[PDB]
C-alpha cells in the first residue's frame, strides 16, 4: 500500500541540571531506523534498522551535523518560547516537532506534514498547502512572523517534495523484504467466566505488522462499539504488534457474537467465534 516517513524531535529543558536535551528519531511506517541523543557520550545519528546500515560516511556525517546544529537551535527556541509565555526560569518545558511525507503505491507524494507542540499543546503547524501556517495563539504568531520573514515554508516544501520523497523510496527498496512485507495477525478467542450470569470473550491478534488493525465484536451482526473494551495496540519487541478486544456476554448467548479482524496482511477479513 502507501507509506510514510516521519522524524520526531523532542527538546526538553531541565534548569539546574545542565542544558536542554535534544532527541531525534526517524521512522518509516512503524519501523524506527535512526536516532540521535545530545546526552550520548559521543552524540551522532546512529542506525536502528539493518537496511540503513549500508548508508555511507557522507550520510552519517550530514545527519549528525544537522542534529548537533539542531541541539543548539532548539535550546535557543526553548529560551524564546519561555519569553513568549512570560514563564519563569525555573520550570522545565518541551518543544516537540513531527514532520515527514506520505507517498502512495507509485511513490508519489500524497501530502507533507510539519507540526510543533509546546508542553504537549498544539503550537504551530504548516498547512497542507505547504505554503501557509496555523498558529495556535499569540505566542505562536510571533514564531509565524519570524518564519514568514525567513521564508521557512518554502524550505520545508522543498524538503517535503524533494528529499523526503526520494529518500523514502530509497529506504523502501533497500528494506523491501521487511518494510514492504505485511504480516497478518494470528488470532484466537478466549472465554473467561465472570459469574453464573456472564463471561468475557476476548479476541486476540498477535504477530502483525504494520500496527494498523481493526478488531470489532458484533452481536447478531451489530457492532458492540460502546460495549467493547479495546486495548491500545502494543509492540511485541520483534517489530510486530499485539491487540485485543473484549466483550461481556450473557452465559448461553456466546454464539450470537462474532469477532471481525481487518489487517492488510490478510487475504480477506476474518470472522471468529468462540469454539469451546
Amino acid at each position: 500500500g502507501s507509506h510514510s516517513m516521519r522524524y520526531f524531535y523532542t527538546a526538553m529543558s531541565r534548569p539546574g541540571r545542565g542544558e536542554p536535551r535534544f532527541i531525534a528519531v526517524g521512522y518509516v511506517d512503524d519501523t524506527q531506523f535512526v536516532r540521535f541523543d545530545s546526552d550520548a557520550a559521543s552524540p551522532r545519528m546512529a542506525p536502528r534498522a539493518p537496511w540503513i546500515e549500508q548508508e555511507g560516511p557522507e550520510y552519517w556525517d550530514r545527519n549528525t551535523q544537522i542534529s548537533k546544529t539542531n541541539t543548539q537551535t532548539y535550546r535557543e527556541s526553548l529560551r524564546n518560547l519561555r519569553g513568549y509565555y512570560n514563564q519563569s526560569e525555573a520550570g522545565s518545558h518541551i518543544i516537540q516537532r513531527m514532520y515527514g511525507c506520505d507517498v502512495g503505491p507509485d511513490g508519489r507524494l500524497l501530502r507533507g506534514y510539519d507540526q510543533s507542540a509546546y508542553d504537549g499543546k498544539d503550537y504551530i503547524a504548516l498547512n497542507e498547502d505547504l505554503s501557509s501556517w496555523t498558529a495556535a495563539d499569540t505566542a505562536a504568531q510571533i514564531t509565524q512572523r519570524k518564519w514568514e520573514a525567513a521564508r521557512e515554508a518554502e524550505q520545508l516544501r522543498a524538503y517535503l517534495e524533494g528529499l523526503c520523497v526520494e529518500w523514502l523510496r530509497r529506504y523502501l527498496e533497500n528494506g523491501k523484504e521487511t518494510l514492504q512485507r505485511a504480516d497478518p495477525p494470528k488470532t484466537h478467542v478466549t472465554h473467561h467466566p465472570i459469574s453464573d450470569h456472564e463471561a468475557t470473550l476476548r479476541c486476540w491478534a498477535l504477530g502483525f505488522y504494520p500496527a494498523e488493525i481493526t478488531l470489532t465484536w458484533q452481536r447478531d451482526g451489530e457492532d458492540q462499539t460502546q460495549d467493547t473494551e479495546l486495548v491500545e495496540t502494543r509492540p511485541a519487541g520483534d517489530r510486530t504488534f499485539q491487540k485485543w478486544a473484549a466483550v461481556v456476554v450473557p452465559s448461553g448467548e456466546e454464539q450470537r457474537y462474532t469477532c471481525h479482524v481487518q489487517h492488510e496482511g490478510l487475504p480477506k477479513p476474518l470472522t471468529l467465534r468462540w469454539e469451546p
Partner: peptide, 9 residues
C-alpha cells in the same frame, strides 16, 4: 534523511 536545520522559533 533529516531536513536541513531550520530557523529558531
Amino acid at each position: 534523511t533529516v531536513r536541513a536545520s531550520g530557523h529558531s522559533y
